[PDB]
Amino acid sequence: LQPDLVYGDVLVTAFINKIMRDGKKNLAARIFYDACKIIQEKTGQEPLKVFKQAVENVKPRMEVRSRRVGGANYQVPMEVSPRRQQSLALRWLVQAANQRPERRAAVRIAHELMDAAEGKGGAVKKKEDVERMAEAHYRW
């Protein structure tokens, strides 16, 4: 990936690609930088640092991976590659923000990022559940 325009960061670009729909990088980028503005205005913190901490806190280290082998579906406990840690982290961040109550996407994103950076919210909860599952007889 190419580093983003404002922060010259590739993780930002991958997130903007997640937020993107209809191939409108134009709108996506504006959405992300507005979210950043909202973070700064509301916290006084540097939004890039908040975004990065949010992503780090949502990164799963272990997971029960769904995999098809020889025509059958299996669930394999395993460590998550750094590549997949990022894809899962960005996916869950966007999925959670997508269900936030606010009308503006930038606001939903800013609110999800701030929560995750503080170690709370649905994205972080998903990560915790995934690692918990990865770490019997009748399975519960």
Swiss-Prot record:
One of the primary rRNA binding proteins, it binds directly to 3'-end of the 16S rRNA where it nucleates assembly of the head domain of the 30S subunit. Is located at the subunit interface close to the decoding center. Binds mRNA and the E site tRNA blocking its exit path in the ribosome. This blockage implies that this section of the ribosome must be able to move to release the deacetylated tRNA. It comes from Thermus thermophilus (strain ATCC 27634 / DSM 579 / HB8). This is Small ribosomal subunit protein uS7. Keywords: Ribonucleoprotein, Ribosomal protein, RNA-binding, rRNA-binding, tRNA-binding. It holds the Pfam family Ribosomal_S7. Gene3D superfamilies: Ribosomal protein S7 domain. One of its GO terms (molecular function) is tRNA binding. One of its GO terms (biological process) is translation. One of its GO terms (cellular component) is small ribosomal subunit. It comes from the Bacteria. Belongs to the universal ribosomal protein uS7 family. Coiled coil: none annotated. InterPro entries: Ribosomal_uS7, Ribosomal_uS7_bac/org-type, Ribosomal_uS7_CS, Ribosomal_uS7_dom, Ribosomal_uS7_dom_sf. CDD domains: uS7_Bacteria.
